[PDB]
Structures are given as C-alpha cells and as structure tokens.
RNA sequence: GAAGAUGAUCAGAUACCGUCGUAGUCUUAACCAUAAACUAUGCCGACUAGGGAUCGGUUGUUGUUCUUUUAUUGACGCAAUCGGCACCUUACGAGAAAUCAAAGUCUUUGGGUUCUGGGGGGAGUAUGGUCGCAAGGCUGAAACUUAAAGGAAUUGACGGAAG
C-alpha cells in the first residue's frame, strides 16, 4: 500500500482532490511521484539519451549513468526527468520517478481562426537552458511537429500537434536540449492574452477547505 | 618558441633578405 | 480561450497576481494567497469568510509584498492612514 | 471596515512607549521610509507606532483565518524571542519552532521535524532568513517582526518594531497573542484584561 | 514602490531636489531689496548678483559676487521680494 | 544625442512595465507620443496618462495596468504599402488573433487592423501587444 | 545599437561592408580567386585523363600503420604531375 | 581568466604611478602595486630594555622608536610570508588581519 | 582516551526516550535493567551502554540535557517557566506615574489623539 | 647600466649571483609613431535596485575649538542636491561560465553611428605601394599543411607553495 506523508498526498488519496488543475491552480507543489499515479493514470514514458559521465579519482575513473526521460499523457501535460545512478536500469527508474513530478500543464491555442479543438501554441515561445535556444512557433492545422527529432518526440508527448521549431546554440548537447524545449513549452500560461484580462475571484485554497482532512 | 623571441628571429631574418636583394 | 462552438477549450485558467497582475505560473513555488479574516461589530472574526489576495513571488522576490498589502489593504477597507499615495 | 474598537487604545500606546517600541535602527532600509515617524537627534529612528498597532491587528488577522490551529508555526532564532514565540504557541495553539531552524524542514519530507505550516510568523528576517528562505519554496505566506534596517525581501505582511529591545519583541509577542485570541473570543472583548500579564513573554537571564 | 504619486510630490522632497530635475523647474534664486546703514532706498539686488552692485544713493557697494548667492555687506539689510 | 524621443518612450515604458510598476514618467513629450498612446489606450494596454506642461517640449505620466507584453518601435520607419503588411505582422506579432502594427500614415497614426479596414498605408512605427 | 547602420539612406554602407567581409568566407574565396582554374590540378574539372609515370608505396599517417598504394600520374590537359591513389583490394594489380 | 576586479593594483581614474623598488630585492615595483607596511620598532630589544636603563646617565630617558615604512613586490611579500594565498572567496576581503 | 562511539551513544538516547522512569542513577541497576530492555548479544557491549546510560541518567540531575527529550522535561518546565511578579514592570508604575518617553518622540504620542503625561528626556547626543 | 671584460656556480654556461663598465639614462633642436598604449569592455543617448563612504562646487543647519573677545574667520558636525573616481550586497535580467549596475532593457530579435572577426598554422610572412635617415610603421596574400587549436569551470594527479 501508498502510504502518504503530504498534505497533498493526504488529499489526494481521498476524493478530496481530483484535478490536476487544482494543484496547478493553487501551485501546490507535488513531491509524491504517486500524487501524479493517480490523478494523471496514463502517462507515457520514453528514454531520449544514456549518457556515461566519469569522476576521476586516485586510483581510476568512477563512472556512473546519466539517464534523461521524457513523461506527457499527449493531453496537455508533459514532464522531463534527468537522473544519474550507477545502474541504467535505475538511473532510468529513478528518472522516471522525478519526470512525473515535474509534469506541467501545456496551453493548447489556435493559429488564425478558433474552430475545431486547439491545435497548436497561442503565442510564440521560447526557452534557454545554457546555449540552446528553442523557439516554438504555431503552425497552421496542416503543418506537424516540424522540429528535430528529440525536440518532436517532447512535443509529440504534450499534444501538441501543429508547431513550428527553430533552434539554436550547442544543439547536440542532448539535456540542454529538452530543458531549454521543457521551458518553452511550460511557458504557454505565462503569457497573458486578451481573453485572460478579465479578472476571475480568487477561490478558496484546497488545503484550507479540507484542512482537517489535510492535517494528516 | 616565445612570440616575442619569434617575433626578434623574423625581424633579423627580414633584415637579411632586404641587404641581399640590395646586391641585384 | 473559447473556440467557435462554445466551450471552454481552455483548462486551468490560472489567477493573476494582485500587484503586478502577472499571471501564476503552475510552478511558481514563491506565489502565496494571503486570506485576511471578516470581523463582525463585536470583535470576533467572522468564521468561513476571507478576503484573498493572490501574489506573485516576483513581488515577493523584490520584497515589494508588504507594500502592495499595504496598498491593497488600504483600498480595500481595511487599513487606516498608514499607506500613502504620494511619497 | 474597522468597528472603532479595534484603535490604538491609550493604555496600549503607554505599554509600547515604554517597551521602546518606538525605537528603530539608525539607517532606514528603503522600504520602511513609511514607518519612520522622525529621527532622534543623535541619528537614530522614530517608529510610527500609531502606525504599528493596526499592523498587529492586520497581521493578527491572518492568523485567525487558517481552520487549523496547529497549521500555524511560529519561529525564533534569537534568544529574547525563544520563550515569548514558545508562550505564543501554548496560549495559541500554534506550532512553535525555537532555536535553530533545521534546513530541509519545508522541503525534506522525511525528516523528522517535518511540517506544513499554512502561515510562518518571523521574530527577525536577518536572523531568521533560513525560515523565510525555505518558506520560499512551498508556498507559506510569511508574517515579519521588521526593524528599520531589517531586510524585507519575500515578506508578505511586516510588523515594525523594535527588534533589539528585551521588553519590545515580547511586547509585540504578547500583542499578537491578545489580538488573536480576541477574534477567535477567548478573551471576552476588546474591554476585558487578558488573564496573561505583560511581563510574561519575556526572556529570563539563568539568575532568576 | 510600485505605485506612487508623481505628479502630486511631497513639498519637502521638492525643496531638496535639483532645480532642474524637479516636475516642472523653478529657479531657487529670488531678488532682494537691501536697505543699507547710510540711508533707506529701495533698490533689487538679485540674490546671486555677479557684479559688486552699488546704490544709486550712496557710491557703496552692497554685495560682492561669490559662487553662489551674493554676500551682503555688513550693516546692510534685505528683503525678499 | 536624443534621437527619437519615441524610442526613448516605449523603452521606459517597457524597463518599467516588467519591473512591475504601475505608472512611468515620459520625456520629451511630442504629438507623435501623445498620438501613439491613444491607439494603446483605446485598447486598454494602458491607462489615464497625464501631459505635464512646463512651457516645453512636455512630459507624460503613464498609468499602467498590466496587460501590456511588449510595445516597442520598428527603427527605421519602414515604408510599409498593403501588400507590406502581412510580412510586418508575421514576424513582429506573437499570433494572429492580437497584438498590433502601428503606423502612420497620410490619414493619421492608426494599427494594422484599421489600416486594412480602410486600406490605407504609409510608414510603420512601432508595435504593440 | 548593433554596431552596424540602421538608417533609411544607408543602403549603401550596407551593400559595401558585406561584400567586403565576403572574401574571409574561403567558399566565396576560392570561387572568384579561381583558384581551382590555376592552381588545382583538374583546373576545376570533375574528372582528368593523365598517364602513369611510376607507381609507389606510402608509409601511412599515425596511428595507422600500412602502405598507401598509389601511383605518379601525369596529366594530359595541363602536363601536371600529381598522386593518385588506387583503391581496391589488389587493384594495383590491374593499372601498369 | 580574470582573477581580481582590482588587477591586483589599486589604479583606478589614472594613468601612470611611479614605481617604487622592492625592500628585498631592489625589483621596480609600481607604488599603488607595492605592498607597504608601517612598522614602529623599538630601538632597543625588550630584554635589553633594563641594563640599557641602567647605564643610562639620565634619569626616566624615554628612548625613541625607529620608524620605517617597508615596500615590497608580490615576489618579495609572498616568500617572506608578509601576506600568504588566500582562498578564492577569502580573496574579496581586503579588511586587515585582527592580530595586534 | 575513554571516548564513547555513536552506537553505544545513540543506543543509551533511545532508552531514556522509552524507559526514563525506569531508569536510575546506579550503574548497577542499569546494568541489570538494559539486559530485559534491550538484546544485546556481548556482555561488554552491555556494560558500555549502561554505563553512559547512567552518565546521561547522572546527568538530567544537574539540569537538562542538550537533544533528549523524554516526554516529561518539558511538561515539567511547562509548569515550570510560568513566574511572573505581582507587577508587569512595564505599567506605568516604576516610574513617578508617567513615562520618561522622550520629548521629540512625544510628538508622535501628541500627533495621535493621547493625552499621556511624559517626563521628557532630552539627551540631543 | 644593454654591449664588453670579469670572480664564482655548473658537465657546460660568455645566464641567473658578484665587481667594473661603453651607448643610454638628463637636456636643447628634430625624427620615429609603436606597447598587456588594458577597463583586454568604441562613442553619444534614455530607463532599470538598494546602500554607505569620498573629491570639487553650491544650498540650509551645531553641547564644537579657534579668529579675538564675537560676528561678516576658518576647521569640524548634521541634512541636501549637481557632477565625478569608485566601492558593498542582490540578481528583476544577462552570460558557456568566470562574472556583469552593465557585459541588462538581445528569437518578446530595430535609439544613432564608426571600426573589426569568420577553424589552427603558413603569417603580419612574400610581393607591390606608401611613409621613415635608419631601425622600422601602414596596407597585405597565396601555395602548402593540418582535425583540431582555444575559452570557462569540475574531479583527480602533481608542486623545488601556504596553513
Ligand atoms: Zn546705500
Ligand atoms: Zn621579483
């Protein structure tokens, strides 16, 4: 059995809280890998890169396995693990465990008119993780994922179905890759638009309704 | 060799080749 | 974000700072949602019944939080000539 | 708004008069200029302390809105305020955090003194960063106790007082505790003397 | 401050800024009339007077130029138009 | 030297707009500022703003809401005819149901949306989203 | 801002600098200089005739250690002498 | 790269400074550059302090210090151990050592 | 050096934090006592953690002990550390009867609707 | 004190160490026009975050000593602003990082403008031109050759470095 020790994790295991979107609406951080078990149950894993880095040390080389995998339910939310361990095997297991608690919500929009359901980005953006540079830029519904293969593989895993791509700096540098691609993406709702001006009452904060179901 | 030291080498090595094409 | 026929296609719309009205990212670990309690005429706080401010931990961050409670705060009714307009 | 209660009664103005409480640091960091009444001619600061009280009140006020009473953790890093915030917490309910701040608290979920507050309250940002820092990271609401040269970074709610004074961070302590207990209404109205007196609240030297 | 008052400033943060850098600029320096010790009769002096001005009474000079403001000559008295 | 006081408008704009605060102070004022604030005030991007006169080239105070992404000058004033636009749009606007093209034109200072509406055209000026 | 001119009547200034800087690309380099028309064996071509004028054996580069079996060929279009390398397990068998 | 903001000089809106050559071993050092320290010695050493005072001829003579500013190179600070390496973020403190 | 290890340190903590009443000042019933308490399988291993078990048992006499809680200091503290004089001594009443607050600062007690007699102290230094 | 001569040291040192020493070092008339000529950071303009010292000016002010016994003395002390030379913290932001109040306001790419670079060598070489008494400066390739050269930082190893 999946024993909690958060107050998360204590609403969670209830039917107190079910949407993903309230713990993204009130940005409440998910340290339980099994919080995301639950609530996002179809999640899809996929290893883009083993990598073999070497601490030299008197006597030889320590080597240990660095591992980065990609989660996303092609749905709108998408997660990105790194993790180094002296086994592959766990070194990929592990990473899993932390892609799922990075997953974010992705913002789904419209390139030129609003009809059928969202396609691509409602907006140009872009991230930066050391020199890589990964713009994404919204495509009409014809066009796919028009991106390099690890950058199309994230986005394939987002739902996002039309988009344009446009990269820059050490592109091979395979970690940076994703994480300046990760960025991009999760910054689809930090961006205001029209639609979003009007201001909507704050509600009530899920740990302060349920608070003695969330003591412990 | 130290760049100013192959610096001074080519100067004196310049040197030489301007006083043997004064011979011509 | 509504398309043509009518439904919200759009999921989790998000908040918007008080402050700077920035919007909250789903992962901005320094955000918090101060509540501040409705008191009836006889002193005892009102139970069930906050007013919420939204912050964003960019406010936070330039530690300009205090400030815009004051402001807020004062705007809002419950603050007495301690924030002033003009400085 | 405010029933007309809720004012800087005159017994409470002599109380934080004489505690000092209208004693701030020489150097005013840029965001506590409103808090500055005036400057003593030797070249230290005035608090406002009619701007003071309702601070309390209006920090106070947060407190009271968290269900759980449990969910509210005050800490103390210095040790004129070690007794006052563990006497706060016993009258209150509170979850106190005395002494040293263990980093990985907020963050480290198998730790031991793992906890969850709803709401921090802060003897002293400088000497209290740790916990202001940390409740950085998991989205707890910060309440302040601010000199005029404390730092006010990540502070969502600041108390101006005297931060360096004995009788003044037990004061304001003290205040804090009336203040709340008053809207929850264990103590009976803004009229009645609390059972506690003021001299409780305040850090004894091993003498005795 | 993310939100202040610009074109409503305090008086006293006026009264100590640049007379160029304040919201519409207005010259600190004003015009004076100097009663000297000899005899009365009314005469503007500018407060920072680069010539050794004299009275048309008396051939004494009121103020030498300094710097700044004009330095009155001792037993003479002014008044600020 | 001060080249364009347009320039030096948006950008005091814009190092105060991500900086959070709710108001900015302009200088130089010009007919060009004042006209080029009204197209962003008649769509909300901005507030009240104020002309100061000191008997000069003028001052602006700037109320701000914060809705305002980006607003920024296209330098040189490019000759921009209808069939212009399109490229104009595309590669400065961030997606093609808002943010606008400001220019100038023989009819007055006016967006791309109603530039086309009455299908005219002169020199692009700015942008706004 | 930027370094380079930005004003309306500087199209000139612009046409000038990148032509200049053209030349430090050595694709642009080689194509004007038309090197390959004087100085390249081929004189630009794709493929040559020439005629062999003695076959040799080449020590190899490090860290490799074998023999590079290539021969001396003359040119018949420009009478130039240049190495040209046979390869194919025992091809050197079949060109004399 | 660059080790220190200061250049390890104190040259700041200036050109040039006259150098100054080096206690030890006479090496052309600039002045700002120059390590300088001010000692106040007693003439006399502490032991000998009594027996010079008693064959003193004047009564409480109150003998007088030498005085000597001392300048020395990197070179020659750094191997008679006047000031030693320090860390990298010991590096940003410039305020004196607290042993006197 | 007679230096105990962390083994038998931490191993003597735990048994105060459960067996505290339980416990004495005597090595001897120590001794005794952690053989029913706890399986230690050397005899010397036994005798280690008695004997430092006492030290700390020999030690909460003369006060309380830095990181052991035994579930009864503080509730003896608890209805320990509430002293508290007849007077709060921050009435106004060490004094004449009003408060030696200082003149300048008395304009902000005068700048507030407070009529509060003050002895003013102007120290201008 | 280059050169040179010298006494040591050394396997050898016409090097470091020692003793002399000629041009030079100084100056007046003229050339040369180069330096790690460095802030390795073009110049002009605007904005952005706090803080305290300091220089020149100027503006209001002291339980201060002095002029002189006081002013209209001076110095000191406290508030201001102008301009500087800078320094401390933070990172909204930038950066490959070191770091950066500019190296920010740069894929949300546009203030004006000048110059410069396009893998490492060959090579600032050859040649031509041009300036210079000369030494040299300015301009300035190619053939050929090579898979690297290099920047910041991490671990270790090593030091005739410190603790
Ligand atoms: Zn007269
Ligand atoms: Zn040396």
């Not at chain 3, 330039?62 to 809002?76: F, H, I, V």
């Amino acid at each position: 059995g999946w024993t909690p020790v958060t107050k998360l994790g204590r609403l969670v295991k209830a039917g107190k809280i079910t949407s993903v979107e309230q713990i993204y609406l009130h940005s409440l951080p998910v340290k339980e890998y099994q919080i995301i078990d639950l609530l996002l149950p179809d999640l899809k894993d996929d290893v883009m890169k083993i990598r073999s880095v070497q601490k030299q040390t008197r006597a030889g080389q320590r080597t240990r396995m660095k591992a980065v995998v990609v989660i996303g339910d092609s749905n709108g939310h998408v997660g990105l693990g790194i993790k180094t361990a002296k086994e592959v095997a766990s070194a990929i297991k592990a990473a899993i465990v932390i892609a799922k608690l990075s997953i974010i919500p992705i913002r789904r929009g419209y390139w030129g008119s609003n009809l059928g359901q969202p396609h691509s980005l409602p907006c140009k953006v872009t991230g930066k993780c050391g020199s890589v540079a990964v713009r994404l830029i919204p495509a009409p519904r014809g066009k796919g994922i028009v991106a390099s293969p690890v950058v199309k593989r994230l986005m394939q895993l987002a739902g996002v179905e039309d988009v344009y791509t446009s990269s820059s700096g050490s592109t091979r540098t395979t970690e940076n890759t994703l994480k300046a691609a990760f960025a991009a993406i999760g910054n689809t709702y930090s961006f205001l638009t029209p639609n979003l001006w009007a201001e909507t009452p704050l509600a009530a904060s899920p740990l302060e309704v349920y608070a003695e179901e969330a003591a412990a | 060799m130290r760049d100013k030291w192959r610096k001074k080498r080519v100067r004196r090595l310049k040197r030489k080749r301007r006083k043997v094409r004064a011979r011509s | 974000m509504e398309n043509d026929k009518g439904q919200l296609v759009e999921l989790y719309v998000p908040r918007k700072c008080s402050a700077t009205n920035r919007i909250i990212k789903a992962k901005d670990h320094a955000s918090v949602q101060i509540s501040i309690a409705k008191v009836d005429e006889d002193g005892r706080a009102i139970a069930g019944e906050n007013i919420t401010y939204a912050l964003s931990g960019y406010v936070r961050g330039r530690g300009e939080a205090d400030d815009s409670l004051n402001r807020l705060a004062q705007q809002d009714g419950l603050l007495k000539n301690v924030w002033s307009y003009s400085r | 708004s405010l029933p007309a209660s809720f004012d800087l009664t005159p017994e409470d103005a002599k109380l934080l008069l004489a505690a000092n409480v209208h004693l701030g640091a020489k150097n005013v960091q840029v965001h506590n200029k409103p808090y500055v009444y005036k400057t003593r001619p030797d070249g230290m600061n005035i608090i406002n302390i009619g701007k003071t009280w309702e601070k309390i009140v209006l920090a106070a006020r947060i407190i009271a809105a968290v269900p759980n009473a449990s969910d509210v953790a005050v800490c103390s890093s210095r040790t004129f305020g070690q007794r006052a915030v563990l006497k706060f917490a016993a009258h209150t309910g509170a979850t106190a955090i005395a002494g040293r701040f263990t980093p990985g608290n907020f963050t480290n979920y198998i730790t031991r003194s793992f906890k969850e507050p709803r709401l921090v309250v802060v003897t002293d940002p400088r000497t209290d960063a740790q916990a202001i820092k940390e409740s950085s990271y998991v989205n707890i609401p910060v309440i302040a106790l601010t000199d005029m040269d404390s730092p006010s970074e990540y502070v969502d709610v600041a108390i101006p007082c005297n931060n360096k004074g004995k009788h003044s961070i037990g004061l304001i302590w003290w205040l804090l505790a009336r203040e709340v207990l008053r809207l929850r209404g264990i103590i009976p109205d803004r009229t009645t003397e609390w059972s506690v007196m003021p001299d409780l609240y305040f850090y004894r030297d091993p003498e005795e | 401050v993310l939100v202040q008052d610009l074109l409503h400033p305090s008086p006293a943060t006026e009264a100590k800024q640049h007379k160029l850098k304040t919201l519409v600029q207005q010259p600190r320096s004003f015009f004076m009339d100097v009663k000297c010790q000899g005899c009365l009769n009314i005469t503007t002096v500018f407060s920072h007077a680069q010539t050794a001005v004299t009275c048309d009474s008396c051939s004494t000079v009121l103020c030498t130029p300094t710097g700044g403001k004009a330095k009155l000559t001792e037993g003479c008295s002014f008044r600020r138009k | 030297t001060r080249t364009s006081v347009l320039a030096d408008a948006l950008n005091a704009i814009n190092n105060a707009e991500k900086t959070g605060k709710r108001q900015v102070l302009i200088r130089p004022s010009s007919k060009v500022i004042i006209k080029f604030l009204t197209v962003m005030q008649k769509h909300g991007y901005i507030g009240e703003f104020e002309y100061i006169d000191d008997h000069r080239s003028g001052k602006i105070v700037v109320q701000l809401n914060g809705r305002l992404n980006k607003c920024g000058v296209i330098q040189p004033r490019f000759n921009v005819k209808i069939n212009d636009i399109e490229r104009w749009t595309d590669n400065l606007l961030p997606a093609r149901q808002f943010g606008y093209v400001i220019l100038t034109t023989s009819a007055g200072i006016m967006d791309h949306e109603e530039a086309r509406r009455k299908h005219v055209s002169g020199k692009i000026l700015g942008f706004v989203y | 801002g930027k370094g380079k001119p930005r004003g309306l009547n500087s199209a000139r200034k612009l046409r000038v600098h990148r032509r200049n800087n053209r030349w430090a690309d050595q694709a642009y380099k080689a194509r004007l200089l038309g090197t390959a028309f004087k100085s390249s064996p081929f004189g630009g071509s794709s493929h040559a005739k020439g005629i062999v004028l003695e076959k040799i054996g080449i020590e190899s580069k490090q860290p490799n250690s074998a023999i590079r079996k290539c021969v001396r060929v003359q040119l018949i279009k420009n009478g130039k002498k240049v190495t040209a390398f046979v390869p194919n397990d025992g091809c050197l068998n079949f060109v004399d | 790269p660059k080790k220190r903001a200061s250049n390890g000089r104190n040259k700041k809106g200036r050109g040039h400074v006259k150098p100054v050559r080096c206690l030890n071993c006479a090496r052309c050092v600039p002045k700002d550059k120059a390590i300088k320290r001010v000692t106040i010695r007693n003439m006399v050493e502490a032991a000998a302090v009594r027996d010079l005072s008693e064959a003193s001829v004047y009564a409480e003579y109150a003998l007088p210090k030498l005085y000597n500013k001392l300048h020395y190179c990197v070179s020659c600070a750094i191997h008679a151990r006047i000031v030693r390496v320090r860390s990298r973020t010991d590096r940003k403190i410039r305020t004196p050592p607290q042993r006197k | 050096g007679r230096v105990r290890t962390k083994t038998v340190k931490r191993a003597s903590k735990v048994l105060i934090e459960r067996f505290y009443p339980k416990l004495t000042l005597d090595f001897e019933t120590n001794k005794r006592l952690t053989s029913e308490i706890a399986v230690i399988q050397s005899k010397r291993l036994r005798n280690k953690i008695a004997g430092y078990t006492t030290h700390l048992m020999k030690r909460i006499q003369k006060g309380p002990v830095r990181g052991i809680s035994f579930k009864l200091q503080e509730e003896e503290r608890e209805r320990k550390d509430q002293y508290v004089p007849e007077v709060s001594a921050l009435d106004l009443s060490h004094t004449n009867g009003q408060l030696e607050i200082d003149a300048d600062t008395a304009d902000l007690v005068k700048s507030l609707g407070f009529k509060i007699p003050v002895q003013t102290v102007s120290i201008s230094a």
